Write a protein that binds this ligand. Structure first.
Ligand SMILES: COc1ccc(F)cc1CC(=O)N1CCC[C@H](C(N)=O)C1
Ligand SMILES: [Zn+2]
Length: 139
C-alpha cells in the first residue's frame, strides 16, 4: 500500500484504489495501473521533473529503503493477476531489487523529488509506475 499526496490530489495504484477514490475520480489509466482522486486537504509532495535513472525506494516487506538504478519509462509485458489479464503496462521502469505484492504503493524518489510508485515485481526485479510526465499534478 501507499500513495503520493500533491496539492488537492492523491495518486495510488489503480488495482488498490478504494470506493472513496472512485467517487472522487480525477483520472485513471488501466494501462499504467494509476488512479488519481481529489482530496479536501493540501498535499506537500514534490513531483520530480527530470530524466534521472537512479533513486531510492521504500520496500515495506523489508521495512527498508534501497538505492537502485532504473530503466526509462516504457511498455513492459506483465503477467496476469486477479486485477488484470496478461498485458503490456506503459510508463513502467524496472530495477534490480526486492519486492512482494504488498510493496505496491512504495515511493521511488530521486534528488528532485517523487518519481513514481512500486507497481510490479518478481524474480529479483521491481517495477515502478512513472509519474514525472503528469505535469497537471502541479497546476
Ligand atoms: C510488487 O508486486 C509484486 C512483487 C513480487 C511479486 F512476485 C508479485 C508482485 C505483484 C505484481 O507484480 N502484480 C500484481 C498486482 C498488479 C500488478 C500490475 N501492475 O499489473 C502486477
Ligand atoms: Zn531526478
Amino acid at each position: 500500500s501507499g500513495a503520493i499526496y500533491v496539492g488537492n490530489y492523491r495518486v495510488v495504484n489503480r488495482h488498490l484504489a478504494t470506493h472513496n477514490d472512485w467517487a472522487n475520480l480525477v483520472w485513471e489509466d488501466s494501462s499504467r495501473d494509476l488512479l488519481v482522486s481529489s482530496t479536501t486537504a493540501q498535499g506537500c509532495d514534490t513531483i520530480a521533473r527530470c530524466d534521472c535513472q537512479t533513486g531510492v525506494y521504500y520496500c515495506s516487506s523489508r521495512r527498508k529503503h534501497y538505492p537502485v538504478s532504473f530503466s526509462k519509462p516504457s511498455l513492459i509485458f506483465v503477467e496476469a493477476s486477479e486485477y488484470y489479464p496478461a498485458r503490456y503496462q506503459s510508463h513502467l521502469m524496472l530495477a534490480v531489487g526486492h519486492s512482494e505484492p504488498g510493496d505496491c504503493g512504495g515511493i521511488l524518489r530521486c534528488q528532485h523529488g517523487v518519481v513514481g510508485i512500486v507497481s510490479t515485481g518478481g524474480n529479483g526485479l521491481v517495477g515502478f509506475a512513472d509519474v514525472r510526465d503528469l505535469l497537471w499534478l502541479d497546476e
